[PDB]
Amino acid sequence: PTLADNEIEYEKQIGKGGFGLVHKGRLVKDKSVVAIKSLILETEMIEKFQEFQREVFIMSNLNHPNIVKLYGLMHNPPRMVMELVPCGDLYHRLLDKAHPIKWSVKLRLMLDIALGIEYMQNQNPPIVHRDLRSPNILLQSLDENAPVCAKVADFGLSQQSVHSVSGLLGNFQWMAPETIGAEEESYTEKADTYSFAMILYTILTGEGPFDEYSYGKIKFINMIREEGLRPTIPEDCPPRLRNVIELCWSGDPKKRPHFSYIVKELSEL
């Protein structure tokens, strides 16, 4: 949690983010594998700074198997040295239509994500991620017997406050109705629960949430908020899962369940 200047060999670039680049690396002492996130700079630059900083502050206190870990910080640009999750992100995996994820594995993924969010929500005060979407779910392993299959990543937009937070969120297909409207109304970690419903939906169907509809942006947002528009749950969905998704994506945040219930229900599938 103290810096790590050098001691890191770069191996390859694996991604990009809101504030910089992401590379796969090795450590010399152990040679253990790692991921490095750099910060590369009204202003956009301030948002980038704030985001990098926010990820560090939030991640600084977290330790859970289903949460990417922060290992150290670096100072030359600067950088966050984190856990390397080798199977990539969920969004890309789901695009491989020819190789559907095995049902047992889908369940592992759902549970693992729920456990991570449950842990976020049990913090004092609770953490609201605000960016829970498939690109931000990383895959440790697709083996149904692995210790960990999925981890929550990218805490750049995260808040951890005693009160409700606010701020308009884009990526409306993944975000709660109370967070996407033009008037900047307040919300809570119940917003993340809604996003999780959409994560459940994407895993279940292998489809992007709301991809079945086509509307202009204003109409789409109004539909989600004022008409209760939601993705259609397939007929073949197991009843207990259908129930969890429906409750989680309730228009009323108060109706979205506590993760103790969500985790118990998912475990029954």
Ligand SMILES: COc1cc(C(=O)N2CCOCC2)c(F)cc1Nc1ncc(C(F)(F)F)c(NC2CC2)n1
């Ligand atoms: C071997 O590790 C990966 C491979 C990929 C991957 O499958 N690639 C295939 C196509 O070229 C780019 C990398 C990936 F997207 C993410 C990987 N791992 C990983 N591990 C940790 C993180 C991090 F920063 F959040 F802590 C992360 N961020 C993703 C890249 C934006 N990615």
